Amino acid sequence: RGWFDLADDWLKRDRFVFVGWSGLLLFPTSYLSIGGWFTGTTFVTSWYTHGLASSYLEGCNFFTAAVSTPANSMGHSLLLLWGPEAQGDFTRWCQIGGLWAFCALHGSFGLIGFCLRQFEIARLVGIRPYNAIAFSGPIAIFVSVFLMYPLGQASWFFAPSLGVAAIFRFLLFIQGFHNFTLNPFHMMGVAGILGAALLCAIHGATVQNTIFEDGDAANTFRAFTPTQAEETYSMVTANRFWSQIFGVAFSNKRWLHFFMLFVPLAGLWTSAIGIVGLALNLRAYDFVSQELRAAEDPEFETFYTKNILLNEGIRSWMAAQDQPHENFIFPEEVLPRGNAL
Amino acid sequence: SASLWERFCSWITSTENRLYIGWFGVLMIPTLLTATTVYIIAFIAAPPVDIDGIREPVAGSLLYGNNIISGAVIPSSASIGIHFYPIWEAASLDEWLYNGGPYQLIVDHFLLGVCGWIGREWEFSYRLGMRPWISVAFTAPVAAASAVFLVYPIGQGSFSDGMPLGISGTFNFMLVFQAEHNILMHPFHQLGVAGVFGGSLFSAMHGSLVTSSLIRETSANYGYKFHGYFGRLIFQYASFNNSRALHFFLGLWPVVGIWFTALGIMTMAFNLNGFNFNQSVVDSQGRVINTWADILNRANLGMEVMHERNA
């Protein structure tokens, strides 16, 4: 038939790994992003961007190695290898943090390709595409945290660097400079994630503990056959159990699974809204009434004020080394301390 | 039936009461109700508590200037330590309130209540003739609560180190714990983070796969009356063909993660802290080349220098 038809037939072949049309975008972008992350964590340094060593070659381990964000002198530049910053020089491109931009961009396009892959495969198996809508959660997380937040900030420098200790630094930095725990959208995100973990554990235990005795063996994993029209566990027994233990219980399996889908997705989207708010420093950092009460009453103290003091200490004691481009020099006298208070 | 005690047993252990009581419910309900009402009364009107023990009270009540986010039940005074501090062991009700006694009351009754809840889940599973290991799953949040409320004060030697019964108090507990112990670099908190993230991912995946393959019997939820897609999304081998094994894994993963993070909290209660990669890179001349662990340590030091509030 037509070239398209033949190419569509070949891409849709039942192989070990489905390729599809979405594969043409997913496989190269994802492969390049992963390989660039490995290359950065193995060879590329962060000495000229953050003043840090972040490579196995420099002596870092799995936790401390990272693909660090570009230098604060770059701004929100695409940092193309052929761009005016690098001008085709691979060494200077790696030294200025261009590999982080490479990984971030090709990884965003890889996430788009994987979402399209979920859509394509759902259209072939003939099922509703409730995947690639669940994956919209992680997509929103990545877009808000690694793309929208640095774009709202001064440069790519304040984006999370692709590493374990780098991610921990990013957590503490955001807590210090934004008080992100106090953000209600982050609270909804935490509630969503913890509730999703709760739902996963409780649903697994409930199904495992309400199975029908469909086998004579003590180990009951064999009593489930792959094409089973009958239900393998008692929904009525599980309903009665939770109705009389917790006071409320699921009666519709459909609803239950949609709820288990909905909770983490809603949590991730709320956290994404909160991070988008943080991108412009539009943060729920402080309560004005509490600050006014503490200002006119030195004997008034709450855990919120202690958190404010902790955030101030974090900012003051991490600014010098976390933002070396600013050339912050803070004398010991102006550094906040508990005794200094 | 034949005895007053038999009648009482047949009503405590009856499966017809809207909510099962059971024998564990005989201990669970009074303790949980007591802790609940004491927590409500303290969250609205409790006096400020001298948590540090240096005669500077901290307010956590709605009536003393707190909101829902900033309100908390302040932990017991550092002068109390982990001494048993009921109401009758205080000279006056005012001094009991001043030293954080309601925190101890709520914590003890709540731990007894959650132990009773574990036992009551087992008891109703036995009454209904089902398998009893839902309580084993529920042990993990109970373990975490006991670690943050009881085990850590025991290891540190004061209930003032326990997690405050609030939101901002919880955030303060997390920040102080990260400063003192570097929990982020602790492998057990990493296992707990992996557990909760995997639980969210697996809940979303299972919900998506079940909702995607709903058989047309119809809202679609009224279609219910009271593997190929997954093996093509990834390689064919990675797939849970057995539904029972899939649900066992769903139950197992976050429970194991929360067990590991509770064990990590318990170990750090006795000062078995996280990994320390500080000053791990040096040049030829001997100058320390900082890593991301050094920045993390700088943040931890910044938090720690304002917790002492003393020498």
């Binding site: 595409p129 929103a140 988008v276 | 709903l214 019997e217 679609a220 279609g223």
Partner: peptide, 29 residues
């Protein structure tokens, strides 16, 4: 406001595109 609106409308684009492209199987498989 418009950044949050753009993100929520990306979610809406995903949902409504899935709705119109997989309409036949919406009541179920």
């Amino acid at each position: 406001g418009h950044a949050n609106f753009a993100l929520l409308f990306f979610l809406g684009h995903l949902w409504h595109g899935s709705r119109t492209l997989f309409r036949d199987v919406f009541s179920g498989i």
